[PDB]
């Protein structure tokens, strides 16, 4: 069995959380000083620790010793909260329960005093899926909240909530986990699990994670399965190559340096999986246009292309503008002529060959 790494390694303490200092420090100071707000909201990308931090805060609020930022983890309340059997902690999957009738019964329990806890904690996750009537009921409940109830909200789309709901809760935004922290966490987990590994494999997995720890753990599990109980550089590289889906940028880089063999290999790899050739041409045209814009002004490239920022910057810095314009025009002509080519693959190959070796002759 061995369980799953994502489930097994849930952070059970504030010290186990990776990064997110600007949130944990504020929460600890608030708990120590007694400055506790009525409603908390957590936002961020996938797999950054919103639910983990919410559960840790809920555990800290209702600990036997007292309101502290360092829960003991041994009293009955801590164990029940960890196992998910605590009576005074109500966890609501708003995605599964969206209708007003379902939410009304849950929200009507605020009229009963807590059974065995200082506070009655409601942890509503995926709260952006609620309907308008559910939002109205939640707002009415939050207008006059009893002094012994707290609301914790977690979502990835805070813009979907009404402004009235947002204005009555304190919002914390979580950040990406960065490559170094992800690599360190993976190394620690593998060392605890007694699994052989190499630095290069860990670096590749961390880079492919793209700021999400759950993605990193899933990739690590897949690599362990592929490597037959071991994590090796060759196995991880092969696995990533299998899932690689950025043939457009690689094709652009190969074409710009006039390397026909690499272009043919990339075309074969793209054809190995099911891809739309016109989509590939559109992606290449978009990449060339973005490179031209970046050459015009460095601010053109934004945070949406953070994954391939370095390669785009290098291409913009190295390639002269005239070559970029020539390639863009050649690809435009190729896209225009694609429908009448003998085949889509043949059309793409002919256009890439023309870009590699040939130059059109313009009138006059």
């Amino acid at each position: 069995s061995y369980q799953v790494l994502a489930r097994k390694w849930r952070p059970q303490t504030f010290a186990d959380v990776v990064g997110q200092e600007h949130v944990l420090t504020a929460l600890a100071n608030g708990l120590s000083l007694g400055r506790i707000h009525h409603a908390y909201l957590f936002s961020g990308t996938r797999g950054v620790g919103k639910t983990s931090i919410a559960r840790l805060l809920a555990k800290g609020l209702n600990c036997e010793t007292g309101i502290t930022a360092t829960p003991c983890g041994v009293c009955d309340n801590c164990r029940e909260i960890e196992q998910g059997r605590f009576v005074d902690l109500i966890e609501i999957d708003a995605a599964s329960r969206t209708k007003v009738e379902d939410t009304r019964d849950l929200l009507d329990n605020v009229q009963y005093a807590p059974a065995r806890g200082r506070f009655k904690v409601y942890l509503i996750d995926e709260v952006h899926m609620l309907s308008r009537h559910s939002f109205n009921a939640l707002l009415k409940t939050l207008e006059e909240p009893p002094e012994h109830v707290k609301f914790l909200l977690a979502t990835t789309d805070p813009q979907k909530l009404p402004v009235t709901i947002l204005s009555r809760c304190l919002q914390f935004h979580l950040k990406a986990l960065d490559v170094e922290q992800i690599r360190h966490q993976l190394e620690h987990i593998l060392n605890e699990e007694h699994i052989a590994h190499e630095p290069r494999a860990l670096q590749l997995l961390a880079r492919a994670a793209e700021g999400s720890l759950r993605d990193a753990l899933s990739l690590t599990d897949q690599a362990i399965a592929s490597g037959d109980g071991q994590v090796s550089t060759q196995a991880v590289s092969a696995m990533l190559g299998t899932l690689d889906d950025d043939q457009a940028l690689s094709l652009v880089e190969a074409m710009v340096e006039a390397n026909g063999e690499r272009v043919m290999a990339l075309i074969n790899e793209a054809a190995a999986r099911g891809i739309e050739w016109e989509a590939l041409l559109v992606e290449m045209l978009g990449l060339l246009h973005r490179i031209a814009m970046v050459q015009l002004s460095p601010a053109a490239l934004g945070n949406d292309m953070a994954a391939i920022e370095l390669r785009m910057r290098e291409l913009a810095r190295t390639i002269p503008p005239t070559d970029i314009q020539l390639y863009y025009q050649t690809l435009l002509i190729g896209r225009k002529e694609l429908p009448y080519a003998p085949d889509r693959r043949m059309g793409v190959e002919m256009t890439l060959l023309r870009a590699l070796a040939f130059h059109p002759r313009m009138p006059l």
């Binding site: 009576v87 379902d102 329990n109 009229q111 009963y112 005093a113 059974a115 065995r116 009415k140 207008e143």
Partner: protein, 366 residues
């Protein structure tokens, strides 16, 4: 777990236990009934994390101790659909329950009994036994005045107060109030609690009008009721209920007495054409005369006149016909007494010969 029972001995307790359950529960386990066989006794339990119902049945046939959880509606339908006088044999095999009756076999899925929530024990503070008739009278008198959905939670329930040798039920919603009180024949310490709507509904349902006394225990934050082999436990709402004594008029100078049925019919006829949106009517009271008028935006008017026992000065007052009709329906008596002071003051409605129940209605701005 194995046992054998009769359809008659199981049909009614199962219905009572499974009545509260409905809709989509918060958790799947809450949608099931807990069955426990032990020391020649079958216990059926049903809860929804707010109130609990427990029923017991005696077994006089070979059985094996155990515990499990089964679907409520499915099991009830299966038991009800069998022919009258049949014998039902229930057995547990693996993760399945087998029900046999004659040549009919049914297989049902179950869940572990360890996951079923159980309410923690608490110590009662007041205990008293009263006939079912008194509780039924109090509930039927004071139920209709409770609020439906208000931000002030304490108004959604009913106030039960023990004072001396008297038990009083009060309900209100900010626009109308109903109060009733009955003796119990035993002295109890002064106390007051608030019962939620669902608790009152279940307490009303569990009463069957039999001679078995109803035993009530009230604690810090919970209330338990015993009736025969049925136990009902509920939680209490936290808050402060408004004091009803100040609501009653201090000195109502004007009095009136009217036939209940005639007044009810006149109000119904007036409301037939009253504005549906507002449901407002206007009453003109004069010497031995009461006139009821109503109108709608389409310039259509309805009028009625009747005789009463009145001796004060002429007056006009507006009302919401719904509240008056509800009060009249609540009071089943030959004559009704109305007490009032002016057109901007509350009106008291009571029975001509009975003082146990009283109602207060606030006039509408008209």
């Amino acid at each position: 777990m194995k046992f054998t029972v009769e359809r008659e001995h199981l049909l009614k307790p199962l219905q009572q236990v499974s009545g509260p359950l409905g809709g989509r529960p918060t958790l799947p386990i809450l949608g099931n009934l807990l069955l426990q066989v032990a020391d020649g006794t079958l216990s059926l339990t049903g809860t929804d994390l707010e109130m609990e119902m427990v029923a017991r049945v005696a077994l006089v046939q070979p059985h094996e101790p155990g515990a499990t959880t089964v679907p409520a509606r499915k099991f009830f339908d299966i038991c009800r659909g069998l022919p009258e006088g049949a014998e039902i044999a229930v057995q547990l095999e693996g993760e399945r329950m087998l029900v046999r009756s004659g040549r009919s076999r049914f297989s049902l899925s179950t869940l572990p009994a360890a996951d079923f929530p159980n309410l923690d024990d608490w110590q009662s503070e007041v205990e008293f036994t009263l006939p079912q008739a008194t509780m039924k009278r109090l509930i039927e008198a004071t139920q209709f005045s409770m609020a439906h959905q208000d931000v002030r939670y304490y108004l959604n329930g009913m106030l039960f107060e023990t004072e001396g040798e008297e038990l009083r039920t009060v309900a209100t919603d900010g626009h109308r109030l109903a109060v009733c009180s009955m003796p119990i024949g035993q002295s109890l310490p002064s106390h007051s609690v608030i019962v939620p709507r669902k608790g009152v509904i279940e307490l009303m349902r569990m009463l069957d009008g039999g001679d078995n006394p109803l035993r009530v225990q009230i604690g810090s934050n919970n209330i338990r009721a015993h009736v025969g082999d049925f136990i009902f436990t509920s939680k209490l709402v936290d808050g402060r209920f408004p004091d009803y004594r100040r609501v009653l008029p201090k000195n109502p100078d004007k009095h009136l007495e009217a036939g209940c049925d005639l007044l009810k019919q006149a109000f119904a006829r007036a409301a037939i054409l009253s504005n549906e949106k507002f449901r407002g009517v206007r009453l003109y009271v004069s010497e031995n005369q009461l006139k009821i008028t109503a109108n709608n935006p389409e310039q259509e008017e309805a009028e009625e006149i009747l005789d009463v026992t009145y001796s004060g000065a002429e007056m006009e007052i507006g009302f919401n016909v719904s509240y008056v009709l509800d009060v009249l329906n609540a009071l089943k008596c030959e004559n009704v007494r109305m007490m009032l002071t002016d057109s901007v003051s509350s009106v008291q409605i009571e029975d001509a010969a009975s003082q146990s129940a009283a109602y207060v209605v606030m006039p509408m701005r008209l």
